[PDB]
């Protein structure tokens, strides 16, 4: 169980926890660091309607929390505020010691409603939810996190707000927020830089809502996106 990777001078070699490796030289406990890596390097999709199909609710299992020391600069970080349709809370409050993920290039903040059926929110493929040096297997409310995993080895800022209707089902609808009466309906293909050009163009050209009601926009299937993320 739980293999310790060995950075040999050539390359990375997994070591057996059953066989005895005499090639290992371990002369500190500073030579043991527990590093956490992000999923978005593996090539998963990153946009919210292609991500929250991998989250579900379930009841009757307690959370578990493990720490990790070093992490990866994230490209996307999420944050949730989901309420039940009667008005109660879905996700549990953050315990003490829980802080947001520290380095985030974009922060998807999502609020809204959904048929919350469960006690917590787990990751359907078995990944963790990385926090401030803490890997957890739930999603605590109101704390900026990423998606990713943890590996053990031997060594030698921009905010985008959303509105979500029907969060837990398969037939969900997301809304991009520009102004608090101005929304744009998402698609599957929207990248964050395209959305940044979108609120620039909307908020500059005066096409926000000039009345009391909401204003929802569609995008024609003619307009490209700005963008392997790292090329």
């Amino acid at each position, epitope marked *: 169980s739980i293999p310790l990777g060995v950075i040999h001078n050539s390359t990375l070699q997994v070591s057996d926890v059953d066989k005895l490796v005499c090639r290992d030289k371990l002369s500190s406990t500073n030579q043991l660091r527990s590093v956490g890596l992000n999923l978005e390097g593996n090539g998963v999709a990153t946009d919210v309607p292609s991500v929250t199909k991998r989250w579900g609710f379930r009841s009757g299992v307690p959370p578990k929390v493990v720490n990790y020391e070093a992490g990866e600069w994230a490209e996307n970080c999420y944050n949730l505020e989901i309420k039940k*349709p*009667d*008005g109660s809370e879905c996700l549990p409050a953050a315990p003490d010691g829980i802080r947001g993920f520290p380095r985030c290039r974009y922060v998807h903040k999502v609020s809204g*409603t959904g048929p919350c059926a469960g006690d917590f929110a787990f990751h359907k493929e078995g990944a963790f939810f990385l926090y401030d040096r803490l890997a957890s297997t739930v999603i605590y409310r109101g704390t900026t996190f990423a998606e990713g995993v943890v590996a053990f080895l031997i060594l030698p800022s921009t905010t985008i707000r959303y509105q979500a209707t029907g969060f837990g089902t398969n037939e969900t609808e997301y809304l991009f927020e520009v102004d608090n009466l101005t929304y*744009v309906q998402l698609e599957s293909r929207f990248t964050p830089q395209f959305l940044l050009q979108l609120n620039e163009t909307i908020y500059a050209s005066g*096409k926000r*809502s000039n*009345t*009391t*009601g*909401k*204003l*929802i*926009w*569609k*995008v*024609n299937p003619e*307009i490209d996106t700005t963008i392997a993320f790292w090329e």
Partner: antibody
């Protein structure tokens, strides 16, 4: 100007079924959402159903789930309502209602407003 | 998803100023509507979203509020308003609403 008219009423046995025809003219019918609102002749209003403009979602009241089915056709400019398993409390007037929106086409892509009311 | 109005039978004479209190079980944030149902008639929109008077209706009708406690207000009562007034909302889409207030003219 804008005409919204109900049709297809009458009398029916308990446990039966019928269909209403809410025809309308005078506006771009494929771009506006439509409603159904119930009023018993001894009581007030109560909502029944709502369909969007593109027939993407269908929203039903609690006491009418399963039994009642909304549908629309943007060809004949006509709203429909299919009813099954009728009961004695359902004796009422049935209103079909048009909602409010302005159509802001002056962009790269369309979209509209709501201010939800009838 | 519930909504409860002022008492259903309010009586006044011509020229009076009357108010109708409307209470909501959840936070709605200005998604309300006031409908005037004359007898023998289809209802008609007075004020959508608790602020804007609809065209065609005179200025004696007004309304305001914040959150869950809104209030429709008639400035001066006219004899052409023997009707029952409803208080509808549209926030979370079960579209449920109040029971109604019938305003009686003292004749």
């Amino acid at each position: 100007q804008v005409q919204v008219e109900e049709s297809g009423g009458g009398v029916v046995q308990p446990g039966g079924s019928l269909r209403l025809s809410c025809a309308a003219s005078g506006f771009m019918f494929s771009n506006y959402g439509m409603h159904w609102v119930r009023q018993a002749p001894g009581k007030g209003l109560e909502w029944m159903a709502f369909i969007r403009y593109d027939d993407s979602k269908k929203f039903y009241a609690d006491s009418v789930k399963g039994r009642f089915t909304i549908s629309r056709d943007n060809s004949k400019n006509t709203l429909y309502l299919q009813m099954n398993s009728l009961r004695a409390e359902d004796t009422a007037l049935y209103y079909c209602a048009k909602e409010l929106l302005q159509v802001y086409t002056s962009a790269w892509g369309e979209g509209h407003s709501y201010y939800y009311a009838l | 998803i519930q909504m409860t109005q002022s008492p259903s039978s309010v009586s006044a004479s011509v020229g009076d100023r009357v108010t109708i209190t409307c209470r909501a079980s959840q936070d709605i944030s200005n998604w309300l509507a006031w409908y005037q149902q004359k007898p023998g008639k289809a209802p008609e929109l007075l004020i959508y979203t608790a602020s804007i008077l609809q065209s065609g209706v005179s200025s004696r009708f007004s309304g305001s509020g914040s959150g869950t406690d809104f209030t429709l207000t008639i400035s001066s009562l006219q004899p052409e308003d023997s009707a029952t007034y409803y208080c509808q909302q549209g926030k979370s889409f079960p579209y449920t609403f109040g029971q109604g207030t019938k305003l009686e003219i003292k004749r």
